[PDB]
Amino acid sequence: LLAEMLGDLSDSQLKVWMSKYGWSADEQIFICXXXXXXXXXXXXXXXXX
Amino acid sequence: GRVVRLHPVILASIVDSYERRNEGAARVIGTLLGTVDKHSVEVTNCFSVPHNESEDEVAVDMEFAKNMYELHKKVSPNELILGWYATGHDITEHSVLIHEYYSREAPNPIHLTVDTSLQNGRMSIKAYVSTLMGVPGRTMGVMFTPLTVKYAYYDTERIGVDLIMKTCFXXXXXXXXXXXXXXXXXXXXXXXXXXXXXXXXXXXXXXXXXXXXXXXXXXXXXXXXXXXXXXX
């Protein structure tokens, strides 16, 4: 699929682009608390008020 | 009545009453004493009441009122029973009905809300007496009139407060924590019943546009959520 998307490349040409971006084949080509509590307290107080 | 003065002792007594139970969710209720025979009501003492609320309905111990007041009278007849207080922080749906009970002891009934959480610095107290403006061509409807408050002290208390602020100038708690943990271990059902309650309140308000009842329900639900957060 990658070779198709790159313009129908031969396996050799595809290798050039995989090499350029560091992609490698795998199985396939490998490509890739306290404060909170305080906040709640304030919010609660506001609600109560 | 034009205004209300409240002694520092009353503020501290309401806080002490609330503190002993150690319940954030719970709101405490009691009696206020003082002098309401002029346009300035002076609130100078208080005592706690046993009080429980179930659903809309609430229970107050009438015998407790009479028996404690009778002892208060033996100490100082000048401090009359002039109303009641609760820890709020806001007016609640049942308050006009509760107020009608206190009316039996004295009239007009006076309600002091003491915000023992103290969310707002300016006021630890909101004061109300029940009155109806009325509607022409219609029967009058009861409502609370909001009265301005100030904190004032006689010399004894002024001396006392100044002395107290000079430097500035557990088993029950464990049980409460355990109860909170139990609530947490259950909150999935209580969530779904607080979701329904919330909807109910909205319905009431819609009808009004009943409304008060719905509003109260909604508030209760919110309170229950806040208590769940605090526990966490």
């Binding site: - | 520092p8 002792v9 503020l11 501290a12 007594s13 806080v15 002490d16 009453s17 609330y18 503190e19 002993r20 139970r21 150690n22 319940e23 954030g24 405490v28 005592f47 706690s48 009441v49 046993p50 111990d61 407790f64 028996n67 404690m68 002892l71 033996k74 100490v75 100082s76 023992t116 959480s117 103290l118 610095g121 630890s124 904190y151 002290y153 004894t156 208390e157 002024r158 001396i159 006392g160 407060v161 100044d162 002395l163 107290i164 602020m165 000079k166 500035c168 557990x170 029950x172 708690x173 464990x174 409460x176 924590x177 605090x230």
Partner: protein, 170 residues
Amino acid sequence: KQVQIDGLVVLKIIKHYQEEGQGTEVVQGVLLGLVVEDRLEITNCFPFPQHTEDDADFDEVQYQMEMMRSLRHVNIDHLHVGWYQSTYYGSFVTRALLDSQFSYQHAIEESVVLIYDPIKTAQGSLSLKAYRLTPFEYMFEEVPIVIKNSHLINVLMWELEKKXXXXXXX
């Protein structure tokens, strides 16, 4: 040893003593609280009615029982940790007051006697002390009294001249 006195306890004792002073009749009441460690917390007090009788036998057990029961419906539910009185004579003028304390000590050996002077108490000077009996020796000794107030109480007190979970955790 230290007696920690709460805000409402101190204000009630000063209020009652002064009211008693106008009366010209000595004023006594009970202190409620907790014995913690050696230290004692006084969280509240209540006044006993004036009696014709002086010192001991002043106490009214019917009044006390009623008051204690009605408070219990109230939240605090705290042991009687001693008694307070206002006594003019100084210093250590009266023998009679001490025997009262022996009665309290026999009920609970940890009991404390507080004495306040409502006349000599003035702005900047509260005249108060706390005593226990000793267990040629003197009969009693005095332990300094400190005051405990919550943050909520501190804010509340500041309205004069204005121009729970936490406590549990602690």
